[PDB]
Amino acid sequence: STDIVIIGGGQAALSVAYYLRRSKYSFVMLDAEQTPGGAWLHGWDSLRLFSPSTWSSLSGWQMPPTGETYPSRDQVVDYLRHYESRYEFPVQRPVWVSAVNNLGDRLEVVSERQQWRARVVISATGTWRNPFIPAYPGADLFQGAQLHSAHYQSPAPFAGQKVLVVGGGNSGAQILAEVSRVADCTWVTTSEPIFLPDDVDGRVLFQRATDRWKADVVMVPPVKEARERGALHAVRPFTRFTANGVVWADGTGSAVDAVIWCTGFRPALAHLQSLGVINPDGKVDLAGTRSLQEPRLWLLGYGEWTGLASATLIGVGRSARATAEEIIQYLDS
Amino acid sequence: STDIVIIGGGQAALSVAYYLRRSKYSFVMLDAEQTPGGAWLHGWDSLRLFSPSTWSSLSGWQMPPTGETYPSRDQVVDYLRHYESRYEFPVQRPVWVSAVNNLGDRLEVVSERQQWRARVVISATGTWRNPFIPAYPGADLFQGAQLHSAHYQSPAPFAGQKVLVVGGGNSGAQILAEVSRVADCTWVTTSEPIFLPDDVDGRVLFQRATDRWKAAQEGREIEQDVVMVPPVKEARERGALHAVRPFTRFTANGVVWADGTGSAVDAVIWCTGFRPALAHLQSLGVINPDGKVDLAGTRSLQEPRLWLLGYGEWTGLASATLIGVGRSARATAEEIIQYLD
Amino acid sequence: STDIVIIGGGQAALSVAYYLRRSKYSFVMLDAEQTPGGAWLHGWDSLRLFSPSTWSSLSGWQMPPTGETYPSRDQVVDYLRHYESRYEFPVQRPVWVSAVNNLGDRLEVVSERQQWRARVVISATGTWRNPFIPAYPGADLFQGAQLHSAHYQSPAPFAGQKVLVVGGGNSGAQILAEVSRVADCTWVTTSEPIFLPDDVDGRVLFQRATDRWKADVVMVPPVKEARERGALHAVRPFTRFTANGVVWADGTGSAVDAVIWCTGFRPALAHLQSLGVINPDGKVDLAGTRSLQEPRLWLLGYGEWTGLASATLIGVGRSARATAEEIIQYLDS
Amino acid sequence: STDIVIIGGGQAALSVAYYLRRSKYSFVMLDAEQTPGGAWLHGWDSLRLFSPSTWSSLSGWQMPPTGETYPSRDQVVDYLRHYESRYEFPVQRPVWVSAVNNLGDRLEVVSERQQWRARVVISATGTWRNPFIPAYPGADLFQGAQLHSAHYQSPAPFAGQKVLVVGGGNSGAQILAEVSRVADCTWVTTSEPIFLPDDVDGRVLFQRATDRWKAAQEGREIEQDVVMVPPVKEARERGALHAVRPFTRFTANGVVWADGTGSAVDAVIWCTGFRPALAHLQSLGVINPDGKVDLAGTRSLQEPRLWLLGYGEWTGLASATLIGVGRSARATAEEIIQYLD
Ligand SMILES: Cc1cc2nc3c(=O)[nH]c(=O)nc-3n(C[C@H](O)[C@H](O)[C@H](O)COP(=O)(O)OP(=O)(O)OC[C@H]3O[C@@H](n4cnc5c(N)ncnc54)[C@H](O)[C@@H]3O)c2cc1C
Ligand SMILES: Cc1cc2nc3c(=O)[nH]c(=O)nc-3n(C[C@H](O)[C@H](O)[C@H](O)COP(=O)(O)OP(=O)(O)OC[C@H]3O[C@@H](n4cnc5c(N)ncnc54)[C@H](O)[C@@H]3O)c2cc1C
Ligand SMILES: Cc1cc2nc3c(=O)[nH]c(=O)nc-3n(C[C@H](O)[C@H](O)[C@H](O)COP(=O)(O)OP(=O)(O)OC[C@H]3O[C@@H](n4cnc5c(N)ncnc54)[C@H](O)[C@@H]3O)c2cc1C
Ligand SMILES: Cc1cc2nc3c(=O)[nH]c(=O)nc-3n(C[C@H](O)[C@H](O)[C@H](O)COP(=O)(O)OP(=O)(O)OC[C@H]3O[C@@H](n4cnc5c(N)ncnc54)[C@H](O)[C@@H]3O)c2cc1C
């Protein structure tokens, strides 16, 4: 029976925890992973961030520099691990929160073995656990291998395969870049993908949304190398799957052994279905981070819908600070 | 490492289990509840079915008869309890399945303490755990009590309250009927609610969809409501089933209607229904934009080792009813035995 | 060679014309119809507005009252006719504007027989001429009659037919109500339709957006009568057409002789394609009424995207006044 | 009241007309231009094709040869003029078709002064009249000159200017090549542009899509750029084909790039291409959300008395080219003669 339950223990949770720990109110953080790390523990082997440590730091404690390379997955995990420990956050892991229940004057946060009664709940569960794969005509038929980027690890199993990498943006480009080295790939995208200039990192992502808060594909090394191997040519979605291929709009067929779906993610709010707050679009209605339908619930770190850049290391701090503030207001009054 | 994992242990799971247990293939059933009973364990005190035991029976073993008329919640729980035990289904409870993962040639069904590798997964998790409450302007402001029908228990806490019962169909009518006796209620509905004739039960629900399933099967063309259970009939006689149309917004302690007038509201009981409770399938990527899965019959198009059973009209006409879930449950079992053979 | 060309001569054009005519600057209005009236000239026979004349008036001159009935189509046409004449707007009709061309320091507004050089263009062409019919699998096959609400006139040709009325909101309900009297109808809608209370008119539409600017189906008589004949039951979209029917999700077939598509309209900006300003969504990017890409172009009266309630008689005046203001500013400076 | 109305009178219209004129059925061609020529009448002064006359010929009558290499705009206009006249196509010009209306058993094709009742409509209106300019933050502010390639004529007005040529592919490269000589240009492109080898013309465009049409026909599986025309080659030699990536926003007299640096820009030539010019089909309700029509081949699914020809890859591989439009034009004629028979 604590004041604030933070569901999830990734960078967003950590961020809001940084801003609450000095306050009066109790909190616990529940996270589904074995160790610290958030979704980063499930990045592919070669995954690196698209901006340096300085543009990939949570509030307070900057990510330690990395030597001549954008931060690696393990390095991000490390930093979250150390960050969590540095500020001595009380995180219970592994814990799967199945539901958040309105018991009247407390919310109940429920897992298999334990429940927590709370005055406030912050849902910071990210997106990784809710990957999106669009349904195409023929999916029933397609015998070949299918793997969402969430679960992409290494290009080895795709060695020699006819592979479709599906979905634009950074994951598709980074995965294509890697898998095109060992397999014959086609990048399928809904729109012609748009690249940043070679000399700017994903900082420009943060910065664009700082301009918008004052009111596109990063050319990371592998992706740059893939341009040089003439492998970033994208095409438009196919019309349907066949048993071992796809048919494109022009009526032609192609063989496909494997599709890597880099089609992104939805907010992983399963644990909020019990609250009735999940809107038709699979999100929650918010003002800022705050649930309109349930104002003791805050949602943090999910995407543009919870705050410009909130689903980034550098960016999640604005809305995390503001969430902490609004929550401290709520609980004072 | 079994052949079929049935996620959930409500009447739908039971139904498909009845049809697989005689086969060669292994299965286990995982269910979230403490005991047998499915969502029925969470019905309100006075909840009764809208059709007799004969029209509320799973395959094989009929529900034992009940007096005067209509089976009670406990009686339905009882029958599921006994049904499960009668056919000796191996159900692990309580188990919360958090995700279904594609490991290549097995699906992994995952809970906190245990995982199961399976050749086939049947998701029969119902809707109760995914109640729907529509957002209205002002929900942020509304200080008064809010309770979805999922959690409605008894009218006692609403004693004397100004209550909105929101949402038509059977739950709203049955809850209104009960809560109007002790509180001042307004039934708010998107459309004028439509009542069945007083002398027909929810059997007509089943029957309509049998006509429509005779139609789809045979190939013929066809075309295209509140049961008057006792309490609901009584509520008509107390002139209490007058419904009005949605308000425009909440205020801190009321709602403002379209005409601009305000009303005080202490409590809103949302009888606005439920979505399919497929949280455990988000990990599979199969959840479509409408929060469902794309199916042919019960079968997942995107993931054909996954079947979905018992959720609603979208998994089969009448599949989300005791009597009705058996068609699609038999056909799921058949299709699954085909797949594995 | 005038200062302002107003393309289109419906209520939106009229509205902005009311606000410019007292100013210094010249303007002409070009409209495609034979007579005054805008899209109203193409309403079905029984079409009436969903709110009284007082809640269906343009600026200045109120619509004359109507006796115990919401204003009729002819009455709206009449009022536009008289309104246009009352303020002596110079409207050239019939004139089809095919394109708006950037000639440097003038825009050129082009029709077959005439061109106009202008400092400013206001596009107030409404939506009627750009009806939307969604494509369903099987449309190629469907032999039966098809008619968008734009062209619906009377229920007589549907006499005895198996009819699908497709699309919710007011047109579907009003057309269903009428056609269900003489044909066997199914109302197909993407979502369960939501009715206003019986004693409130489409004024509540205006009012909702006045609340939002300070910051759903009207039960018109026929539609009320149709509820009483138990005919407003809606169902969800079918999955596909067959040659003489549709197949629903449950796999069942139904015979359909006729589909009336009440699936609405897009903005009728064909004449702006030449300007390059039509965004991917088939609209123009705006601040208020003003084209971002082409700031001598204003768009008025189209929908929520040009202004809350701007596509209504009562509502179009806010954004029409503001357009006139912004245009008078532009041309002074 | 004719059988077939062909809307538009460019090379696509001509092509399908070649294939219908020997048939029994009447047709008329309506075209918006003052003279024959299609969009070619609006090409820039120095515009030449990217492949020789032999690879730029419509069906039947080949384009007459040209010296040194590559047919000029006037030469293409000429050939369309003569082609139209040679086969005596009845083309009404200038006629702007504003809408195509379904009157039941005829389609009505409408212009200001005249209407035509038709059993079949072929929309062959190209893309030129629907140029695309993407919106960037700051477009409201940008005071400097803006000109889509559609209207580019000559580099003279850009003399000495700081110019952005926006958009890759052939137009941007050809316009840059010309304007870089007289102005200070930056080529802005979404991706690094890719050049064909110096010794191959836009024939390779046709040929790629013949391989792909041999593939679709025969049923085999297959898989899935700037021609180095003379001026463009010259521009490489002047080191002027260096492209950069889109800027982030316009300012009043410049752009700000991603790195945060600013540049002055007097003029932007948008070589960002074209959409299908189907305005006259909005009235039919057939325009899909992507601004196209749903087709099987050339044929409208929603309105099967409507065919669309010559627009791009979506109406047929290479159909928006002189050499390429003939496959789909023959097949359209065939399908239309079938329909009417
Ligand atoms: C492929 C990829 C590349 C990216 N690259 C970058 C980059 O270069 N720079 C950048 O700034 N951002 C990047 N991001 C974005 C973002 O920083 C990561 O997505 C990060 O995972 C977001 O952290 P989070 O805390 O919002 O979500 P997560 O890291 O997912 O944290 C949520 C935590 O909550 C847990 N959880 C979920 N549900 C429950 C439950 N019911 N009960 C208990 N725990 C639960 C999860 O297991 C997880 O441990 C990238 C994202 C992806 C997918
Ligand atoms: C108010 C109301 C009245 C109704 N009245 C009738 C009636 O009169 N007659 C009739 O025939 N039908 C009626 N129904 C419909 C239907 O019979 C019930 O909804 C019933 O619960 C459907 O059974 P099910 O097995 O499909 O779903 P459920 O009964 O919910 O069973 C699914 C089981 O799966 C479990 N589960 C969910 N998620 C997980 C997970 N991740 N891991 C493990 N287990 C999980 C649930 O806890 C539950 O135990 C009614 C429904 C409602 C809401
Ligand atoms: C079925 C229906 C019912 C409605 N009911 C109501 C109601 O009850 N109350 C209410 O307030 N609103 C109602 N509306 C909304 C709105 O008031 C009407 O749509 C009205 O038509 C909008 O007027 P407008 O001037 O924006 O558009 P329009 O009336 O279409 O005016 C545009 C004019 O521009 C012309 N035009 C188009 N393109 C060109 C071109 N290229 N060159 C020259 N001229 C051109 C058109 O022919 C037309 O004459 C309704 C709309 C519909 C469709
Ligand atoms: C810069 C550029 C370079 C190109 N170079 C080559 C090349 O080298 N080789 C090659 O093979 N192809 C080339 N193309 C492609 C193609 O040959 C041209 O686009 C050509 O115009 C396509 O012919 P069309 O008949 O399909 O379209 P169009 O030539 O535009 O003809 C359509 C006709 O219909 C008319 N029209 C439009 N709307 C209406 C209406 N509502 N009513 C009546 N008439 C209407 C138009 O005015 C036009 O006269 C090029 C295209 C561009 C833009």
Short mmCIF file of N, CA, C and O in Angstrom, two decimals, chain A residues 96 98 101-102 112 129-135 139-141 146 151 267-270 273-280 285 291-293 295, chain B residues 94-96 98 101-102 111-113 129-135 139-140 146 151 275-279 282-285 289 294 301-302 304:
data_model
loop_
_atom_site.label_atom_id
_atom_site.label_comp_id
_atom_site.label_asym_id
_atom_site.label_seq_id
_atom_site.Cartn_x
_atom_site.Cartn_y
_atom_site.Cartn_z
N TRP A 96 5.16 -9.02 -13.89
CA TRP A 96 4.25 -8.71 -14.93
C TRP A 96 2.97 -8.15 -14.35
O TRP A 96 2.18 -8.87 -13.74
N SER A 98 -0.64 -7.30 -14.79
CA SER A 98 -1.70 -7.77 -15.64
C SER A 98 -2.86 -6.82 -15.74
O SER A 98 -3.58 -6.84 -16.71
N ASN A 101 -6.71 -1.77 -11.45
CA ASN A 101 -8.10 -1.86 -11.07
C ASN A 101 -8.48 -0.71 -10.21
O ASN A 101 -7.74 -0.34 -9.32
N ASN A 102 -9.65 -0.14 -10.50
CA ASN A 102 -10.14 0.94 -9.67
C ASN A 102 -10.91 0.44 -8.47
O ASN A 102 -12.07 0.12 -8.59
N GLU A 112 0.52 -11.65 -10.83
CA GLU A 112 0.19 -13.00 -10.31
C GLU A 112 0.33 -13.14 -8.78
O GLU A 112 -0.63 -13.47 -8.08
N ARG A 129 6.49 -4.50 -26.33
CA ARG A 129 5.69 -5.70 -26.07
C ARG A 129 4.42 -5.70 -26.87
O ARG A 129 3.66 -6.68 -26.80
N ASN A 130 4.21 -4.63 -27.66
CA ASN A 130 3.06 -4.54 -28.54
C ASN A 130 3.41 -4.22 -29.96
O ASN A 130 2.87 -3.32 -30.51
N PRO A 131 4.27 -5.04 -30.58
CA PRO A 131 4.64 -4.89 -31.95
C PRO A 131 3.45 -4.93 -32.88
O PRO A 131 2.50 -5.66 -32.63
N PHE A 132 3.56 -4.22 -33.98
CA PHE A 132 2.55 -4.19 -35.01
C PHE A 132 3.06 -4.89 -36.26
O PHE A 132 4.15 -4.65 -36.71
N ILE A 133 2.25 -5.78 -36.80
CA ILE A 133 2.46 -6.37 -38.09
C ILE A 133 1.15 -6.16 -38.82
O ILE A 133 0.13 -6.72 -38.39
N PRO A 134 1.15 -5.37 -39.93
CA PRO A 134 -0.11 -5.19 -40.66
C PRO A 134 -0.52 -6.49 -41.37
O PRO A 134 0.35 -7.29 -41.79
N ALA A 135 -1.82 -6.73 -41.43
CA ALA A 135 -2.31 -7.91 -42.14
C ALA A 135 -2.41 -7.59 -43.63
O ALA A 135 -2.93 -6.53 -44.01
N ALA A 139 -1.64 -13.58 -45.86
CA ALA A 139 -0.82 -13.88 -44.69
C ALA A 139 -1.06 -15.32 -44.25
O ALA A 139 -0.13 -16.02 -43.86
N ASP A 140 -2.32 -15.76 -44.30
CA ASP A 140 -2.68 -17.17 -44.03
C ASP A 140 -1.82 -18.15 -44.81
O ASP A 140 -1.38 -19.18 -44.28
N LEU A 141 -1.55 -17.82 -46.07
CA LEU A 141 -0.82 -18.72 -46.96
C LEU A 141 0.70 -18.74 -46.69
O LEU A 141 1.34 -19.78 -46.87
N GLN A 146 8.77 -15.43 -40.45
CA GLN A 146 8.28 -14.10 -40.14
C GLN A 146 8.74 -13.73 -38.79
O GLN A 146 8.62 -14.54 -37.85
N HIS A 151 11.95 -8.80 -32.38
CA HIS A 151 12.65 -10.07 -32.17
C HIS A 151 13.80 -10.29 -33.11
O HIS A 151 14.46 -11.33 -33.04
N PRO A 267 1.51 1.26 -28.22
CA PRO A 267 1.67 1.36 -26.81
C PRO A 267 1.23 0.09 -26.10
O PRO A 267 0.20 -0.49 -26.41
N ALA A 268 2.04 -0.34 -25.16
CA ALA A 268 1.85 -1.64 -24.50
C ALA A 268 1.12 -1.39 -23.18
O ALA A 268 1.71 -1.40 -22.07
N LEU A 269 -0.18 -1.17 -23.34
CA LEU A 269 -1.12 -0.81 -22.29
C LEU A 269 -2.10 -1.97 -21.92
O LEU A 269 -3.10 -1.75 -21.26
N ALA A 270 -1.80 -3.20 -22.32
CA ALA A 270 -2.57 -4.35 -21.89
C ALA A 270 -3.02 -4.26 -20.44
O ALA A 270 -4.12 -4.71 -20.09
N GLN A 273 -6.23 -2.34 -19.72
CA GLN A 273 -7.48 -2.72 -20.32
C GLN A 273 -8.52 -2.83 -19.23
O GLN A 273 -9.62 -2.40 -19.41
N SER A 274 -8.15 -3.36 -18.08
CA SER A 274 -9.08 -3.53 -16.97
C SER A 274 -9.67 -2.21 -16.46
O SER A 274 -10.70 -2.19 -15.80
N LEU A 275 -9.01 -1.11 -16.75
CA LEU A 275 -9.43 0.16 -16.24
C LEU A 275 -10.51 0.79 -17.18
O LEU A 275 -11.21 1.73 -16.82
N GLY A 276 -10.67 0.25 -18.37
CA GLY A 276 -11.64 0.78 -19.31
C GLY A 276 -11.19 2.02 -20.06
O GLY A 276 -11.93 2.56 -20.90
N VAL A 277 -9.96 2.45 -19.79
CA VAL A 277 -9.45 3.71 -20.32
C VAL A 277 -8.88 3.64 -21.75
O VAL A 277 -8.56 4.67 -22.34
N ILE A 278 -8.72 2.43 -22.28
CA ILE A 278 -8.09 2.25 -23.57
C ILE A 278 -9.10 2.73 -24.62
O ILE A 278 -10.18 2.21 -24.72
N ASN A 279 -8.75 3.77 -25.35
CA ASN A 279 -9.64 4.36 -26.33
C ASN A 279 -9.64 3.50 -27.60
O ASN A 279 -8.86 2.53 -27.69
N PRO A 280 -10.51 3.84 -28.59
CA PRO A 280 -10.65 2.97 -29.77
C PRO A 280 -9.38 2.85 -30.57
O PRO A 280 -9.14 1.82 -31.19
N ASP A 285 -6.75 8.68 -23.68
CA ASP A 285 -6.93 10.09 -23.83
C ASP A 285 -6.21 10.78 -22.73
O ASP A 285 -6.38 10.44 -21.57
N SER A 291 -4.25 10.89 -17.68
CA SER A 291 -5.47 10.27 -18.19
C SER A 291 -6.69 11.14 -17.89
O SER A 291 -6.99 11.43 -16.72
N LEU A 292 -7.39 11.53 -18.95
CA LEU A 292 -8.67 12.21 -18.81
C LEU A 292 -9.74 11.39 -18.07
O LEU A 292 -10.35 11.88 -17.10
N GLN A 293 -9.97 10.16 -18.51
CA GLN A 293 -10.97 9.31 -17.90
C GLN A 293 -10.62 8.93 -16.49
O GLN A 293 -11.51 8.81 -15.67
N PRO A 295 -7.94 10.27 -13.80
CA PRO A 295 -6.87 11.21 -13.53
C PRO A 295 -5.83 10.79 -12.44
O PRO A 295 -4.88 11.52 -12.23
N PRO B 94 -4.58 -20.44 -10.51
CA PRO B 94 -4.79 -19.27 -11.35
C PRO B 94 -3.51 -19.01 -12.11
O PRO B 94 -2.42 -19.15 -11.54
N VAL B 95 -3.64 -18.71 -13.39
CA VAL B 95 -2.51 -18.47 -14.25
C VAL B 95 -2.88 -17.32 -15.18
O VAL B 95 -3.87 -17.38 -15.91
N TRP B 96 -2.08 -16.27 -15.13
CA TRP B 96 -2.23 -15.19 -16.02
C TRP B 96 -1.26 -15.31 -17.19
O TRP B 96 -0.05 -15.15 -17.03
N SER B 98 0.54 -13.77 -20.08
CA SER B 98 0.92 -12.40 -20.42
C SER B 98 1.21 -12.21 -21.88
O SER B 98 1.13 -11.12 -22.38
N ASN B 101 4.19 -16.05 -27.76
CA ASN B 101 5.39 -15.72 -28.50
C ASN B 101 5.66 -16.75 -29.57
O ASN B 101 5.53 -17.93 -29.33
N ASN B 102 6.02 -16.30 -30.77
CA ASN B 102 6.37 -17.21 -31.85
C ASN B 102 7.83 -17.60 -31.81
O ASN B 102 8.66 -16.87 -32.29
N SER B 111 3.50 -17.21 -18.77
CA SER B 111 3.01 -16.56 -17.55
C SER B 111 4.22 -16.24 -16.68
O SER B 111 5.33 -16.59 -17.04
N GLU B 112 4.02 -15.60 -15.54
CA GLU B 112 5.15 -15.31 -14.63
C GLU B 112 6.02 -16.53 -14.31
O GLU B 112 7.23 -16.49 -14.53
N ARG B 113 5.41 -17.57 -13.75
CA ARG B 113 6.15 -18.68 -13.15
C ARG B 113 6.47 -19.79 -14.15
O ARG B 113 7.41 -20.57 -13.93
N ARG B 129 -12.45 -8.94 -19.13
CA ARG B 129 -11.23 -8.29 -18.61
C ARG B 129 -10.84 -7.10 -19.45
O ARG B 129 -9.88 -6.41 -19.13
N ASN B 130 -11.64 -6.81 -20.49
CA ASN B 130 -11.44 -5.64 -21.33
C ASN B 130 -12.70 -4.83 -21.51
O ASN B 130 -13.04 -4.52 -22.61
N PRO B 131 -13.30 -4.38 -20.40
CA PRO B 131 -14.43 -3.49 -20.41
C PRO B 131 -14.16 -2.20 -21.16
O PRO B 131 -13.05 -1.67 -21.13
N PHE B 132 -15.20 -1.66 -21.76
CA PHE B 132 -15.14 -0.40 -22.51
C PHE B 132 -15.93 0.69 -21.79
O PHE B 132 -17.03 0.46 -21.34
N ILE B 133 -15.32 1.84 -21.63
CA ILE B 133 -15.98 3.02 -21.13
C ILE B 133 -15.64 4.10 -22.13
O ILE B 133 -14.45 4.42 -22.27
N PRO B 134 -16.64 4.64 -22.85
CA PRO B 134 -16.31 5.69 -23.81
C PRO B 134 -15.89 6.98 -23.08
O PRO B 134 -16.38 7.28 -21.97
N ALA B 135 -14.94 7.72 -23.67
CA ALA B 135 -14.54 9.00 -23.08
C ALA B 135 -15.51 10.09 -23.52
O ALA B 135 -15.86 10.19 -24.69
N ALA B 139 -14.76 14.02 -18.51
CA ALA B 139 -14.45 12.86 -17.67
C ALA B 139 -13.38 13.20 -16.64
O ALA B 139 -13.47 12.78 -15.49
N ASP B 140 -12.37 13.96 -17.04
CA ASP B 140 -11.36 14.51 -16.11
C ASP B 140 -11.98 15.17 -14.88
O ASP B 140 -11.51 14.99 -13.77
N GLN B 146 -17.67 5.93 -10.34
CA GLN B 146 -17.75 5.32 -11.68
C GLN B 146 -17.40 3.88 -11.56
O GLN B 146 -16.39 3.52 -10.90
N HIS B 151 -17.89 -4.68 -12.97
CA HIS B 151 -17.71 -4.64 -11.51
C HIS B 151 -18.93 -4.32 -10.73
O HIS B 151 -18.87 -4.21 -9.51
N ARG B 275 -14.51 -5.24 -24.88
CA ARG B 275 -13.74 -5.62 -26.05
C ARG B 275 -13.19 -7.00 -25.81
O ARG B 275 -13.20 -7.51 -24.66
N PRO B 276 -12.72 -7.66 -26.89
CA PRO B 276 -12.02 -8.92 -26.72
C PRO B 276 -10.73 -8.77 -25.89
O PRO B 276 -9.98 -7.84 -26.08
N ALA B 277 -10.53 -9.67 -24.96
CA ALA B 277 -9.43 -9.57 -23.98
C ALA B 277 -8.22 -10.38 -24.46
O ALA B 277 -7.97 -11.53 -24.02
N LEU B 278 -7.55 -9.76 -25.43
CA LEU B 278 -6.48 -10.35 -26.21
C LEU B 278 -5.10 -9.78 -25.84
O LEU B 278 -4.14 -9.95 -26.56
N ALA B 279 -5.01 -9.10 -24.71
CA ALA B 279 -3.74 -8.57 -24.23
C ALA B 279 -2.59 -9.53 -24.42
O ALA B 279 -1.46 -9.11 -24.73
N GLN B 282 -0.89 -9.52 -27.86
CA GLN B 282 -0.24 -8.33 -28.40
C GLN B 282 1.15 -8.72 -28.83
O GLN B 282 1.60 -8.29 -29.87
N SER B 283 1.82 -9.57 -28.05
CA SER B 283 3.19 -9.95 -28.37
C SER B 283 3.32 -10.66 -29.73
O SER B 283 4.42 -10.75 -30.30
N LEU B 284 2.22 -11.18 -30.26
CA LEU B 284 2.26 -11.94 -31.48
C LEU B 284 2.11 -11.02 -32.71
O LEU B 284 2.38 -11.41 -33.84
N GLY B 285 1.75 -9.77 -32.49
CA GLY B 285 1.60 -8.84 -33.59
C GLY B 285 0.31 -9.03 -34.38
O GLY B 285 0.06 -8.31 -35.34
N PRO B 289 -6.06 -3.31 -36.21
CA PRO B 289 -6.30 -1.93 -35.73
C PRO B 289 -7.58 -1.81 -34.94
O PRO B 289 -7.65 -0.98 -34.06
N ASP B 294 -7.73 -10.87 -37.31
CA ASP B 294 -8.30 -11.27 -38.56
C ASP B 294 -8.42 -12.77 -38.58
O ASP B 294 -7.45 -13.47 -38.28
N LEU B 301 -5.66 -15.63 -39.49
CA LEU B 301 -5.02 -15.49 -40.77
C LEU B 301 -3.49 -15.26 -40.67
O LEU B 301 -2.73 -15.93 -41.35
N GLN B 302 -3.06 -14.30 -39.87
CA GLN B 302 -1.66 -13.95 -39.76
C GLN B 302 -0.89 -15.01 -39.09
O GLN B 302 0.26 -15.22 -39.45
N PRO B 304 -1.74 -18.79 -38.35
CA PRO B 304 -2.64 -19.94 -38.38
C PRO B 304 -2.47 -21.07 -37.32
O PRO B 304 -3.28 -21.99 -37.29
#
